[PDB]
Nucleic acid binder design. Structure first.
Ligand SMILES: [Zn+2]
Ligand SMILES: [Zn+2]
Length: 373
RNA sequence: UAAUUU
């Protein structure tokens, strides 16, 4: 049993080190809770361990490297078989550890590794982004710890004395910022079937209401809009969950959450989102507030379909337009751009669905009628 | 809280 395999850490140690506030000073130690399991999950781990290591000065003593050494010796002492390793790490790997683990995984196909990270270390630095991409390309599955992973870590590796895990304030908001940033820096691409299903602009027949949203940023330079390749990606709405957002968080609000997190300077920026549903009234109100907030940012909203929220959505779109947002229905060129840019297309060109242009024209006429009232 | 990497 795990509590017999690990010496559980102090609750104060866990809460202070795994707090997922993305920008957090003072934490000079990395913590790593790991389980080693067989191909079959659904058991106690073969073994479990807690490693720690000071961030500075010697990366050779970071817990990732302590794990590699311990796991080498451990595998010597147990009958060989394929292993599934899981880490909960308080900080994501530094460039040296990311490269060492990537080398280890690439040279050993019998081992697969999943890394849940509480916070992203130096996510804004190109070297760290590149090293995490190298780790991903070696096979490591990298994810941000959410409530379930924090709770699992609490249950397995913390001396909670039977008390349940108590989430700190803003755990879900921090989670969404970090997950979007991880998607950006790993350059996650949308699944092609997911894109085609959600961005088809014929009248919607599915019972699902979900919103997918692709985003990019441009900077004004010498009177020309130039690309800002850093902040490009996609996201979706957060369905309601009492451990996350109890009333949900719509895709447009998650998008708005991202913009201050980018820490844009005073230059002129044009932020564009391609959203499968036009925003509901609440989303449009919040976007209008943001526009009134950040004059150095111009919003361009392209929508695949018009979402009738059974309420004030027309007034919402009119308010958004009145406040300076560019709102347009997506036409062929916008769909093709999103296919080429955000989708895991694997060389395949954009294949438009039936009636794309006709549905675009109908929806464009509807949008024009809404905005002219 | 943009957070000491030899
Ligand atoms: Zn390291
Ligand atoms: Zn909405």
């Amino acid at each position: 049993q795990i509590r017999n395999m690990v010496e559980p850490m102090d609750p104060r140690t866990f809460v202070s080190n795994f707090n997922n506030r993305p920008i957090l000073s003072g934490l000079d130690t990395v913590w790593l809770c790991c389980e080693v399991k067989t191909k079959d999950p659904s058991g106690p781990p073969l073994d479990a361990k807690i490693f720690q290591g000071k961030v500075y000065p010697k990366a050779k003593y970071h817990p990732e490297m302590r794990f590699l050494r311990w796991f080498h010796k451990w595998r010597q002492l147990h009958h060989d078989q394929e292993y599934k390793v899981t880490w909960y790490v308080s900080w994501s790997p530094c460039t040296r550890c990311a490269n060492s683990v990537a080398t280890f995984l690439a040279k050993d196909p019998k081992v697969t590794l999943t890394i849940f990270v509480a916070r992203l270390y130096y996510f804004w630095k190109p070297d760290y982004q590149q090293a995490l991409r190298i780790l991903a390309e070696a096979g490591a599955t990298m994810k941000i710890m959410n409530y379930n992973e924090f709770q699992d870590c609490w249950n397995k590796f913390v001396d909670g004395r039977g008390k349940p895990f108590k989430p700190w304030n803003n755990l879900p908001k921090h989670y969404t910022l970090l997950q979007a940033t991880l998607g950006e820096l790993l350059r996650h691409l949308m699944d092609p079937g997911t894109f085609t299903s959600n961005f088809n602009n014929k009248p919607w027949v599915s019972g699902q209401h979900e919103t997918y949203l692709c985003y990019k940023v441009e900077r004004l330079h010498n009177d020309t809009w130039v690309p800002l390749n850093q902040h490009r990606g996609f996201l979706r709405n957060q369905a309601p969950n009492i451990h996350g957002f109890p009333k949900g968080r719509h895709a447009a609000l998650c998008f708005l959450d991202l913009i201050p997190f980018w820490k844009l300077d005073g230059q002129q920026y044009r932020v564009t989102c391609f959203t499968s549903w036009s925003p509901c009234f609440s989303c449009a109100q919040e976007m209008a507030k943001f526009i009134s907030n950040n004059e150095h940012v111009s919003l361009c909203i392209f929508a695949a379909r018009i979402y009738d929220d059974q309420g004030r959505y027309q007034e919402g779109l009119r308010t958004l337009h009145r406040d300076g947002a560019k709102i347009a229905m997506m036409n062929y060129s916008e769909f093709e751009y999103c296919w080429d840019t955000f989708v895991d297309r694997q060389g395949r060109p954009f294949q438009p669905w039936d009636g794309l242009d006709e549905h675009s024209q109908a929806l464009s006429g509807r949008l024009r009628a809404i905005l002219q009232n």
